[PDB]
Design a protein around this ligand. Structure first.
Ligand SMILES: Nc1ncnc2c1ncn2[C@@H]1O[C@H](COP(=O)(O)OP(=O)(O)OP(=O)(O)O)[C@@H](O)[C@H]1O
Ligand SMILES: Nc1ncnc2c1ncn2[C@@H]1O[C@H](COP(=O)(O)OP(=O)(O)OP(=O)(O)O)[C@@H](O)[C@H]1O
Ligand SMILES: Nc1nc(O)c2nc(CNc3ccc(C(=O)O)cc3)cnc2n1
Ligand SMILES: Nc1nc(O)c2nc(CNc3ccc(C(=O)O)cc3)cnc2n1
Ligand SMILES: [Ca+2]
Ligand SMILES: [Ca+2]
Ligand SMILES: [Mg+2]
Ligand SMILES: [Mg+2]
Ligand SMILES: [Mg+2]
Lengths: 589, 551
């Protein structure tokens, strides 16, 4: 009552659940809440994947809302961290200050939660969910104050359900709560510069009780599923075991006891731009536009932006979902044009593309056929000018953001998040072919990428926006490139982006309507070799399709799309039991 | 003492096992034996696959100087064999001229031979069974003739597994060398023979029918299961199929050994062993419908691009195709094939590439065309898109005195103009499969080796696009059979796609076919018939490389 509003500069760890039932807008809704959490509550230092969830039993006013928000009373800083001691403390069970709110014991907690569960069960006797967890390092003093601010956040969004799953190591159950409008105003005022009055009203009745941990933490698969991504090793006093063990037990008991595969209807989601993609449900084509190549393979000396943009339109028409544009070549032994800059190679092209795209009259005819744009850069300044001018959706960083970790701050704005490809390499175009010694090739690269994701996620990059790339041909011998492909299954839990297109390791596999469009006249021998190389990669397209690789980065968009279209058709069975049924019918003659 | 040489012309049914241990020449050796069986013993009316089982050129001369049989060789096609049906049931047959033993005695004497052998014992075998409708009076006469065949071949083991419904165990067989001569002379115009008979005198110690090991060797049951799965001899507990099954299940549940792992089914394209399901072979298409010289360099191009087989045709069978009144099928294909043979032989210079010779396949349904091909040794394979139903007489051309040819049997209905309308099937996948099986049964009854017959579902031929796809989706129904498919550049590919502008459609088609090549690789299709050989080879090499695990 008293210590709730004391001016003690406190640092706490809370774990939240963010849920919505609105599919079309699931991303916008949940990311808006992420922003409001970052703004009003503290620092997001962990996230789970996004998930489409089936429950246990079985407009654009946000835009304007974001423009006119009350400033926080706390400093926002986008600075990078490589660790967070209070988080470390929370994950172990290190000594933390005693709860200012009154705690219950374990047994009393479990009885109160069970009561809520049986009570909600009963009421029910008389939709898809979209879910994400977050860990917040928070300046709010207690879960009751936090819930008040969360209730404010919900109301601001005018559809969204934000729950507190954990708050430090506290065990709390507060049975009856009637906060006067007076009290709400004072909690809010401690954290927000308040203007605005119509909101506090709805809030009064909304907080009936407080349960920490949340009543449903152990009961809802969808929560265990999300927590398992973030904090698998966490054990709270109330819990029988670690998050991971509880998660695994839930899965195997649904199998053993009810004959259900609980994974079937609880789908991991990743995000490329602003829409839901179901992990492993589609192999997307990323069409390659290398401006250097496109311009100077000629033997020419001038960039040709119009030719560049034409090519971008061609690849869209050929069925690319993403275009990857770059102006810094990174293939073996390539010296760049040292006279024209990366920025001048790509930005004009992207600017012209934006202009041509916009020169289209549509209101319901053709509005969402826009390709996602990826920029192959490691360069902060280039990426910054692109996002400032809305030229791109995705950072493709072949250094996994180690060239300049600050580029990571650019993947976040007040209202926008951007997705990012992290790739493994060693060395540069001139050195990489000799940097080939690995203790454990497959796991070294996996562990490297996971460490990078952990770093991005610590810095509040949403987990579902980070894609992995093993970097074929980049400090790998041909046999190693193959081995990475043979062992691609190790990425079955992750959004996977690969680039094999026209690389040397394909030719190493080998013992006419030409698919290589010659830039200069080639010999017959070489045309054949190019043909084999492009066809060799269509083999990897097939392999990728069957391995459920999420994105493939290719020069030959029409060819690749033709392959994926036929594999998709063969896979779409009209009736999934017809083969046994037809067989039995034939035996019965 | 001579009821054996009785002139009562009889028709019996015998089941033989042919075995060799020479892998490199297994086909030549076993097929040599088949020829000699057809010549000396009667008519082959059933064969198993060839199998590799875990337990040189004087032949060419031999085949040129054989003594004639005294019995006739009739080639007319048959559709039924009464004696065989009698044998498949345990129908009533004439009493054995050799004295029979009962089950108990047989089982006792067999067990005696096995145990005596188990302790004597304390490389791969190539095996094949055949059913022979035989003019030989009795199993002992047959063994005499068989030992002669083995001696002629100078390497080969030929056993009598069954002979009618007889149960026989004869212990201490001594045959005077004059009696062996007399038996031989009853079936063969003996014209060297006389320093061969003396070898034989040692050989026949005893005669067991069924053969001692019939029910005890997996390799035997494996072959018999192909031919006569439902057959139950008096002296056996269960039918062939049950004995086979209860040997696979025993070996799994008693040893954790998959017996199928070491025992490989074989098919033959030309003259070498192919392990079923172990390679996706490329068949390059040559449509001569094209000037001979050009056609032939195209053939050489395709070999160099990695085609195992070249399929030449001079009759288009694609939809609504306009025929050529100007030049006959014969005049299109035969000169090309003649020039190829000549051009290939002129590369006798590069003697080191004498085994790089492609298998040649002719896409025809026309007896006259095929007859000219085989007479002039221009081809190895008949690709008959009618499954040999258009003119069944062509089946007679798949055999010579010292040669067998392989055949692709394809399913279709109607003709190029009507096929698009003949699209109603009660059970598309099983109708086509059953049809191909019926065709195979007809050829096998007619003495075509089972292991030389390839199945083809006929994509695009009396199938709507979705039906073509459905066949592909359900290609696993051919897991037991050598499978040949042709998808290359067919309309159904374009139908999969989402939606020099014709060269756009053309490229999509080629690329869509490369997807089917990938699918086929993984489904272990034995042969794929394609236009774009370099492209297909590139796909297969990469997929193969990915499958190959190193250290
Ligand atoms: N940890 C918690 N987080 C959020 N609400 C909580 C918590 N503990 C108790 N509550 C209470 O539960 C209610 C939250 O209602 P909400 O609209 O989020 O959906 P619900 O399904 O009814 O509740 P819950 O959040 O318990 O699942 C409020 O009355 C709130 O006081
Ligand atoms: N049904 C039969 N077929 C072949 N040989 C038989 C048969 N019954 C008995 N035999 C005898 O077995 C001999 C076969 O010896 P072979 O050189 O084939 O080696 P094996 O495998 O030890 O013999 P078997 O074929 O009897 O198992 C014949 O010469 C004959 O004495
Ligand atoms: N995310 C991502 N993933 C790639 O795989 C990639 N590749 C290139 C091109 N770089 C190479 C590297 C190696 C080779 C060879 O060995 O042939 C060729 C080209 C550029 N951007 C890329 N971006
Ligand atoms: N064994 C065999 N197997 C084939 O599949 C095949 N196809 C053709 C060519 N025939 C067609 C049929 C249909 C289509 C279409 O729908 O486009 C095109 C060509 C010729 N010989 C063939 N021989
Ligand atoms: Ca913040
Ligand atoms: Ca005969
Ligand atoms: Mg709630
Ligand atoms: Mg191309
Ligand atoms: Mg023997």
């Amino acid at each position: 009552q008293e210590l709730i509003l004391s001016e003690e500069n406190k640092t706490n760890i809370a774990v939240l659940n963010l849920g919505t039932n609105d599919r079309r807008n699931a991303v916008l809704i949940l990311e808006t809440a992420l922003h409001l959490v970052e703004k009003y509550l503290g620092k997001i230092i962990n996230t789970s994947y996004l998930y489409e969830t089936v429950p246990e039993y079985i407009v654009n006013y946000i835009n304007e809302l974001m423009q006119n928000l009350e400033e926080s009373k706390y400093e926002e800083n986008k600075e990078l961290i490589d660790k967070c001691e209070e988080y470390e403390t929370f994950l172990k069970n290190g000594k933390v200050d005693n709860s200012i709110l009154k705690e219950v014991n374990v047994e009393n907690y479990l009885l109160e939660c069970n009561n809520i569960i049986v009570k909600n069960d009963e009421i029910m006797k008389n939709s898809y969910f979209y879910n994400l967890t977050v860990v917040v390092k928070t300046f709010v003093n207690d879960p009751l104050s936090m819930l008040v601010v969360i209730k404010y956040i919900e109301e601001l969004m005018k559809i969204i359900d934000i729950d507190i799953l954990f708050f430090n190591d506290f065990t709390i159950f507060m049975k009856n709560i009637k906060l006067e409008k007076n009290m709400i105003y004072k909690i809010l005022s401690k954290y927000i510069h308040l203007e605005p009055q119509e909101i506090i009203n709805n809030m009064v009745d909304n907080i009936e009780f407080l349960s920490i941990p949340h009543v449903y933490t152990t009961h809802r698969y969808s929560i265990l599923l999300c927590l398992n991504d973030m904090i698998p090793e966490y054990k709270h006093n109330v819990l029988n075991n670690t998050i991971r063990c509880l998660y695994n037990k839930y899965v195997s008991r649904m199998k053993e006891q009810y004959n259900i595969n609980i994974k079937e209807n609880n789908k991991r989601i990743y995000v490329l731009k602003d829409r839901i993609s179901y992990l492993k449900e589609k192999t997307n084509i990323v069409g390659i536009l290398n401006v250097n190549y496109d311009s100077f393979s000629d033997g020419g000396i001038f960039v040709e932006p119009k030719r560049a943009v034409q090519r971008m339109f061609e690849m869209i028409n050929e069925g690319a979902s993403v275009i990857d544009i770059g102006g810094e070549s990174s293939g073996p032994f390539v010296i760049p044009n040292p006279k024209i800059s990366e920025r001048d190679l790509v930005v004009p092209v992207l600017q012209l593309f934006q202009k041509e795209w916009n020169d289209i009259k549509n209101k319901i005819v053709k509005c969402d056929a826009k390709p996602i744009i990826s920029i192959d850069t490691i360069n902060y300044n280039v990426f910054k000018e692109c996002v400032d001018n809305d030229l791109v959706d995705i950072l493709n960083d072949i250094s996994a953001c180690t060239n300049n970790p600050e580029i990571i701050k650019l993947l976040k704005k007040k209202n926008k998040f951007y997705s990012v490809v992290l790739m493994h390499k060693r060395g540069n175009p001139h050195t990489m072919d000799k940097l080939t010694n690995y203790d454990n090739l497959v796991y070294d690269i996996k562990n490297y990428l996971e460490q990078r994701l952990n770093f991005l996620v610590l810095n509040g990059i949403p987990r579902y926006r980070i894609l992995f790339d093993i970097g074929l041909g980049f400090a790998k011998k041909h046999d190693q490139s193959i081995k990475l492909l043979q062992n691609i299954h190790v990425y079955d839990e992750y959004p996977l982006f690969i680039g094999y297109s026209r690389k040397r390791f394909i030719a190493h596999c080998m013992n006419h309507n030409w698919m290589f469009q010659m830039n200069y006249m080639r010999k017959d021998k070489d045309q054949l070799l190019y043909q084999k190389n492009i066809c060799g990669g269509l083999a990897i397209a097939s392999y990728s399709y069957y391995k459920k690789v999420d994105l493939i980065r290719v020069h030959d968009v029409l060819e690749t799309k033709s392959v994926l279209d036929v594999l998709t058709k063969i896979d779409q069975v009209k009736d999934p039991n017809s083969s046994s049924v037809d067989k039995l019918a034939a035996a019965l003659e």
